[PDB]
Write a protein that binds this ligand. Structure first.
Ligand SMILES: *Cc1ccc(S(=O)(=O)N2CCC[C@@H]2C)cc1
Ligand SMILES: *Cc1ccc(S(=O)(=O)N2CCC[C@@H]2C)cc1
Ligand SMILES: [Cl-]
Ligand SMILES: [Cl-]
Ligand SMILES: [Mg+2]
Ligand SMILES: [Mg+2]
Lengths: 228, 9, 228, 9
């Protein structure tokens, strides 16, 4: 839909859409920018992720409201409308997954980009798993696990334990273990080891890097407090 | 359980 | 788009969409319900108004963010994107106005329904006036004024001065005078007279009606405090 | 200046 707009204009409009809290537009501009075929810079990768996380986040919140009403009720209307929201959510996740597969991951050679995209791949399969119930729910869970695991393997080899991508990957993989994979002990172990290894590396950081790493470490701690 | 946000708040 | 869904199912789904904060869906369900051709009950009129006020409210907030960025900048991107949001906003207002004209107003004979729909008509022309700059900005302002004035004339003849529709109409007409018509003294006079006449009628009300009327009177007071 | 909300909050 965006093929006639310049890449740089799509990027500029995604930034304006974020400022205006127009996240559907933001996601469409960043999809158009990815489809230009060039690799994304760090800031552009964040724009793509912010846009889709906000769109899918609103869908997930709505699906949870509707699923709760449906479970309490158990005419066809609540199920029909939950199904409509669910299909829309699945379509957004499939769109993001398709961008990652065509061709962001295969062109990502640096650790920072490859880990970021594989974390995204894990996240969007995790959102598919949250609504899955059919013949492929196990398979969707394995797809999330596999993407997160490859990202973890690269991050542990190539990034320091305070790197914010590495920390956010570990946070989200721990949520996957707790909420999707029925592995609360693995979730707790991952969050604790990640927190402790980051703490031991904080001395190497500048003030601004310290603020970024400690912000994510606090999220790990908040989950550990909820889980223990 | 909270997952990661995209932006510093 | 909703022609194959039962009226009652559209109403039920609009209520679910409100609960899920899916206001675009809510508006589409209520448009489908209006297009069934039957008159709307009081609760259905509120569903229609809530849905569109939330959709247009988000558009207006985004248009204001973009218009502010554009004014500070004075490439084509900020203007182009402000124009895109503006056209979408205008389209929503035109849709609501079209529902009111085909055929909600003409079939509304009771004061409560006719005043409510004419207040809506004033509001959506007011939102058109907020973005208007062309050959018809004067004409759009007059269309808002005319709708609000007809609603005011009926409300003063047919409803008590504490009636919440009458109060909300007067509140919004006062905002029209202050923000659109460049008539701050008319805005202040209308808000003060409305407040004082409602105060003098509070003694007639039950506890629940008192709570509704005093809530709107506080909004009138909040504007008077900002304007004076 | 605030206009009317649609629902009691
Ligand atoms: C998955 C992920 C996304 C963003 C970041 S960040 O840009 O470095 N950032 C945003 C808020 C938290 C963190 C500091 C890290 C991981
Ligand atoms: C214009 C308007 C819309 C709704 C109402 S209300 O339903 O009676 N209500 C909602 C919040 C304020 C008021 C009490 C009144 C006027
Ligand atoms: Cl590359
Ligand atoms: Cl009638
Ligand atoms: Mg389904
Ligand atoms: Mg225009």
């Amino acid at each position: 839909a965006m093929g006639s707009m310049e890449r740089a204009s799509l990027i500029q409009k995604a930034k304006l859409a974020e400022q205006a809290e127009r996240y559907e537009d933001m996601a469409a501009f960043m999809k158009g920018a990815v489809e230009k075929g060039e690799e994304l810079s760090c800031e552009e990768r964040n724009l793509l992720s912010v846009a889709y996380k906000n769109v899918v986040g609103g869908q997930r919140a709505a699906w949870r409201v509707l699923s709760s009403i449906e479970q309490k009720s158990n005419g066809p209307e609540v199920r029909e409308y939950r199904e409509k929201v669910e299909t829309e959510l699945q379509g957004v996740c499939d769109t993001v997954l398709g961008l990652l597969d065509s061709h962001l991951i295969k062109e990502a050679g640096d650790a920072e980009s490859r880990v970021f995209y594989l974390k995204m791949k894990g996240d969007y399969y995790r959102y598919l798993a949250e609504v899955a119930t059919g013949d492929d729910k196990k398979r969707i869970i394995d797809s999330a696990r596999s993407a997160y695991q490859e990202a973890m393997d690269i991050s542990k080899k190539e990034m320091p334990p305070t790197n914010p991508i590495r920390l956010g990957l570990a946070l989200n993989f721990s949520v996957f273990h707790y909420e999707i994979a029925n592995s609360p002990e693995e979730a707790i172990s991952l969050a604790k080891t990640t927190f402790d290894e980051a703490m031991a590396d904080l001395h190497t950081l500048s003030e601004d890097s310290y603020k970024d790493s400690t912000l994510i470490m606090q999220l790990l701690r908040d989950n550990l407090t909820l889980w223990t | 359980a909270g997952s990661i946000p995209g932006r510093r708040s």
